[PDB]
C-alpha cells in the first residue's frame, strides 16, 4: 500500500547496515539516477540520516520529480528542493496498482491559492475559492473541490500507468553516522603512517592522541584551510589528531 501523491509518507531509517546490492539488481527498473552520489559508490559511505519518501504518480509525470521542474505535481503536491542530494528509484508497477474495473484510490491536488516550499504537506481539503462571493455546502460555480481522483486502467499506454516512486534523501558527512554499508574493522594504530578510513573519510597520516574537548553534539574538528584534523573514534570515544607524514 503506497501513499497518495499529496499525502506521502516519510520514513526514518537508523542504526542499521545498508546494502544497496539487493536493491540495484532489480532488472525491471526503468530509472535509477543519482545527483550527489553515483549509484555504484553507495557501499562505502556512512550517512548522518536517511529518509525514504514514497508515492504513486502517473507514468507521464515521473520525469517531473527531478529538481527545477514545474507543473501540477511539482508545485501543488510535492516539490523537491533545488539542492537535492540522494536519488530517486522509479519503476513501473502496472501489475499491482492498475485495475480492469478502474482504480480509484489515488488523488492529487489541482487548485491551490499559492505554491509550497519544498517538502511541505497539506491534508486540508477546504473548498477552494475562485469568485468574489464565498460559497458553502457543496462546491460548483466559482468554487471547486480541491482533489480529483486518478483513473487507472490497464488499457492506457506508457504515460498512464502508475510508476511507483521511492526517493532517498540523505545528508553527507556533517554529523555522527548511524547507517552505512558492510566493512571489516582493522584495529587501531598510533604514530605509524597508515591509510585510515574513518566513516568514509579517507586520508593518510599518523594518529596521535589529543586533549581538545569535544562538545557532545560534534564529531569532526577543522582548521583554517577547511581540512579535518581531529576525529572521534567510532567504536571507542577517544579524540584523535590527524597530521601528515
Amino acid at each position, epitope marked *: 500500500r503506497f501513499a497518495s501523491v499529496y499525502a506521502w509518507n516519510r520514513k526514518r531509517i537508523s542504526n542499521c547496515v545498508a546494502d544497496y546490492s539487493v536493491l540495484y539488481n532489480l532488472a525491471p527498473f526503468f530509472t535509477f539516477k543519482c545527483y550527489g552520489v553515483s549509484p555504484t559508490k553507495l557501499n562505502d559511505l556512512c550517512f548522518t540520516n536517511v529518509y525514504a519518501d514514497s508515492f504513486v504518480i502517473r507514468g507521464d509525470e515521473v520525469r517531473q520529480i527531478a529538481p527545477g521542474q514545474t507543473g501540477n505535481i511539482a508545485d501543488y503536491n510535492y516539490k523537491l528542493p533545488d539542492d537535492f542530494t540522494g536519488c530517486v528509484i522509479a519503476w513501473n508497477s502496472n501489475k499491482l496498482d492498475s485495475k*480492469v*474495473s478502474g482504480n480509484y484510490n489515488y488523488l492529487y491536488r489541482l487548485f491551490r491559492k499559492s505554491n509550497l516550499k519544498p517538502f511541505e504537506r497539506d491534508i486540508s481539503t477546504e473548498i477552494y475559492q475562485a469568485g468574489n462571493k464565498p460559497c458553502n455546502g457543496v462546491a460548483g460555480f466559482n468554487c471547486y473541490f480541491p482533489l480529483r481522483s486518478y483513473s487507472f*486502467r*490497464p*488499457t492506457y*499506454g*506508457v504515460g498512464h*500507468q502508475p510508476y511507483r516512486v521511492v526517493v532517498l534523501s540523505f545528508e553527507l558527512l556533517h554529523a555522527p553516522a548511524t547507517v552505512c554499508g558492510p566493512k571489516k574493522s582493522t584495529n587501531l594504530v598510533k604514530n605509524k603512517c597508515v591509510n585510515f578510513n574513518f566513516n568514509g573519510l579517507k586520508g593518510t597520516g599518523v594518529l596521535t592522541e589529543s586533549n581538545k574537548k569535544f562538545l557532545p553534539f560534534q564529531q569532526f574538528g577543522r582548521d583554517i584551510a577547511d581540512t579535518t584534523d581531529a576525529v572521534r573514534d567510532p567504536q571507542t570515544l577517544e579524540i584523535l589528531d590527524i597530521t601528515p607524514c
Partner: antibody, heavy 120, light 111 residues
Framework: QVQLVQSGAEVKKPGASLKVSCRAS????????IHWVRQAPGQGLEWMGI???????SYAQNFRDRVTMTTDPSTSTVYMELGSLRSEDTAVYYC??????????????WGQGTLVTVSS | SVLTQPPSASGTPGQRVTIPCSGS????????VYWYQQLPGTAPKLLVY???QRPSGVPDRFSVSKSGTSASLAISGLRSEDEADYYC?????????????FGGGTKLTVL
C-alpha cells in the same frame, strides 16, 4: 460439462449494429476474467478486450470507440454491442475465460466462434 | 505486427522442426510468452504456457526454450495431425498503448 455458447450471426450491412451474447456454465461465473478475441481471414488473431464478470471492462486502444460492454451477473451472460461496421471488419469472434487473476495465465475455455460478413 | 515469425514451415515425418518467435524487450524481454496451435476447423489449443510448465492432456514431446529475447519450439515425431498454424503471444507495452499481442503465425504442413 464446461463450455461457452454464443449466438449464430448472419450477414450484416455496413454501419449496422451487432449484439452478440456469451452464456457460460459449469463453473463459478463471477470468478474469472473474460477475453473476447477476433480473427480475420487471411491474417493472424486480435483480442477484442477484457471484461470483469461483475463490473466494467477494458478494450484494445485500436478497436476502442466502437465496442460496448454490458454485464449481467444473474443469468451468467456477457454481451458485445458493435457499431459503425465496414466491409473490412468481417471476421470470427470468440468468447473465452482466463485465470482469475487475468494477464499471465492459462486459457482452457475458448469461444465456439461466430462469423460476421457483408454480402448481397 | 510487432511479433516476427517465419512465413511458413515444413518437414518430413520423423524429423525435428524448430519454429522461432523473435520480439523485443516490450514483448518478450520482461514477461512470459505463450504458444498457440490452430488446426483446420478446430478451436485453438495450448502448447506451452508459463514457459516452465506443461498443461495436462498434451504430449510433452513439444520441446520449448527461451534463447535470450526469442522463443523456440521444437517438435519431433511429426505426424499428420501436426499440420497446424503456430502463434506466439506475449503481453506487450508500448509508448502509445499496451495489449495482448499475438504472433503473425507460421503455416506448418507436409506435401
Amino acid at each position: 460439462q464446461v463450455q461457452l455458447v454464443q449466438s449464430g450471426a448472419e450477414v450484416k450491412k455496413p454501419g449496422a449494429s451487432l449484439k452478440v451474447s456469451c452464456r457460460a456454465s459449469g463453473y463459478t461465473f463471477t470468478s474469472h476474467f473474460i477475453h473476447w478475441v477476433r480473427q480475420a481471414p487471411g491474417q493472424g488473431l486480435e483480442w477484442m478486450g477484457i471484461i470483469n464478470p461483475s463490473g466494467g471492462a477494458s478494450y484494445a486502444q485500436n478497436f476502442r470507440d466502437r465496442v460496448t460492454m454490458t454485464t449481467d451477473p444473474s443469468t451468467s451472460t456477457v454481451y458485445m454491442e458493435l457499431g459503425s461496421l465496414r466491409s473490412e471488419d468481417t471476421a470470427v469472434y470468440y468468447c473465452a475465460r482466463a485465470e482469475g487473476s487475468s494477464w499471465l495465465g492459462w486459457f482452457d475455455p475458448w469461444g465456439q466462434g461466430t462469423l460476421v460478413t457483408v454480402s448481397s | 505486427s510487432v511479433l516476427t515469425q517465419p512465413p511458413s514451415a515444413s518437414g518430413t515425418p520423423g524429423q525435428r522442426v524448430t519454429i522461432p518467435c523473435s520480439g523485443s524487450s516490450s514483448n518478450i524481454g520482461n514477461n512470459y510468452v505463450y504458444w498457440y496451435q490452430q488446426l483446420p476447423g478446430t478451436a485453438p489449443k495450448l502448447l506451452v504456457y508459463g514457459n516452465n510448465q506443461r498443461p495436462s492432456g498434451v504430449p510433452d514431446r513439444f520441446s520449448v526454450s527461451k534463447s535470450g529475447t526469442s522463443a523456440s519450439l521444437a517438435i519431433s515425431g511429426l505426424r499428420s495431425e501436426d499440420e497446424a498454424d503456430y502463434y506466439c503471444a506475449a503481453w506487450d507495452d508500448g509508448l502509445s498503448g499496451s495489449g495482448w499481442v499475438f504472433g503473425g503465425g507460421t503455416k506448418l504442413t507436409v506435401l
